[PDB]
Write a protein that binds this DNA or RNA. Structure first.
Ligand code: DGT
Ligand code: CA
Ligand code: CA
Ligand code: CA
Length: 343
DNA sequence: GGGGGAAGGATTCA
DNA sequence: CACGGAATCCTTCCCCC
């Protein structure tokens, strides 16, 4: 009953840069996000394995990477490029199933149930998909196969990189008991911790705790999710998913609270955001700010009609005004987010 | 009491 | 010193029948 095949491209941004400049293949490559603030201020979008080996990875400051690997190749993130390559591969996967859910810029779940019997065939289809993607785009990915999206995903995690793996029903039962609950999708450090205090260290433990306390501790939705898995009864279908919001945010040269100093950044964000909107019309706008102490403050508003760029400019100004008046810290970054698209 | 929303923020993942 | 971006969930305050 139902066979899910999850595809996860390998160290995606770095690998795409390798493909576009093979002279890179073989040496450590780090894709970065730089912000004027200073010489090498920014974070690491990601890096290839010939770099992950020494700890350089997503989230750490570019400077830190530089110390560890001073002579590695540091590339500016070219999101737009990775996107179009992503779209191409996404098309290429449709050829294998109508039921396709695009999770992110490099993730996708395929429902190959009414498409192929047993696991032995699932596997092959896997290898087939890899080859095709590999030959067509020269991009290696990892394929996870199991009874649902959750374990399909976990599968790939286990099989990374450029791998493939199937978690059979017998194994599922083993992981519901042996797999560290932390390693379960949707469980970050915050929840992980919350779970330990409650004694829960495995997906199974959830079955030995009174709901209401669990629900009370991690929220009902997270509780039902986990319990669901533990009972080997999880079964969310693979559905299409359209964007629900679009935004842009930029880090300023220096901190500030001066409206007239921030406004320019904010307006660049809006202009950029509208271009990205294309033909979509938003009913809601939020102004998101990152404070000096790396905290995130936001203020929004929904209109009974769509928002025009003019409308956005003036309304974004008030929300920034509101933020300032309601939060004493200097603002480090400023952005906008449009949502609730008409239709 | 409880439905229907909006707003501000928490948590997670890429 | 820690960047862009986006979804989902949760708490809370409201209006109101
Ligand atoms: N800007 C930014 N982008 C990120 C971050 N994390 C991931 N990404 C982007 C670039 C990654 O290549 C892409 C896929 O993330 P994964 O979590 O799949 O990492 P990646 O595919 O690079 O390596 P992998 O082989 O999956 O371990 O998402 C992040 O922290 N900041
Ligand atoms: Ca990946
Ligand atoms: Ca991914
Ligand atoms: Ca985890």
């Amino acid at each position: 009953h139902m066979i899910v095949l999850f595809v996860d491209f390998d160290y995606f941004y770095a690998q795409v840069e390798e493909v576009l400049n093979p002279s890179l293949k073989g040496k450590p490559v780090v894709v970065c996000v730089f912000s004027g603030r200073f010489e090498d201020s920014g974070a690491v979008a990601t890096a290839n394995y010939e770099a992950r080996k020494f700890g350089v990875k997503a989230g750490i400051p570019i400077v830190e990477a530089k110390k560890i690997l001073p002579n590695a190749v540091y590339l500016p993130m070219r999101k737009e490029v990775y996107q179009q390559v992503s779209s191409r591969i996404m098309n290429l996967l449709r050829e294998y199933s109508e039921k396709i859910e695009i999770a992110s810029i490099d993730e996708a779940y395929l429902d190959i149930s009414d498409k192929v019997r047993d696991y032995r065939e699932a596997y092959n289809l896997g290898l087939e998909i890899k080859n095709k993607i590999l030959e067509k785009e020269k991009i290696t990915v990892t394929v996870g196969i199991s009874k649902n999206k959750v374990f399909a995903k976990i599968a790939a995690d286990m099989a990374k990189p450029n791998g493939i793996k199937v978690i059979d029903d017998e194994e599922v039962k083993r992981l519901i008991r042996e797999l560290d609950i932390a390693d379960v999708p949707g469980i970050g450090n915050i929840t992980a911790e919350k779970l330990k205090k409650l004694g829960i260290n495995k997906l199974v433990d959830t079955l030995s705790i009174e709901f209401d306390k669990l629900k009370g501790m991690i929220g009902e939705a997270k509780a039902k999710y986990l319990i669901s898995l533990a009972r080997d009864e999880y079964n969310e279908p693979i559905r299409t998913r359209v964007r629900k919001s679009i935004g842009r945010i930029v880090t300023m040269k220096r901190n500030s609270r001066n409206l007239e100093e921030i406004k320019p950044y904010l307006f660049r964000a809006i202009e950029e955001s509208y271009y990205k909107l294309d033909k979509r019309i938003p009913k809601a706008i939020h102004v998101v700010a990152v404070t000096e102490d790396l905290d995130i403050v936001s203020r929004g508003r929904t209109f009974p009609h769509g928002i025009s760029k003019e409308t956005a400019y003036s309304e974004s100004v008030k929300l920034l005004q509101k933020i300032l008046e309601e939060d004493e810290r200097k603002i480090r970054a400023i952005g906008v987010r449009f949502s609730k698209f008409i239709e």
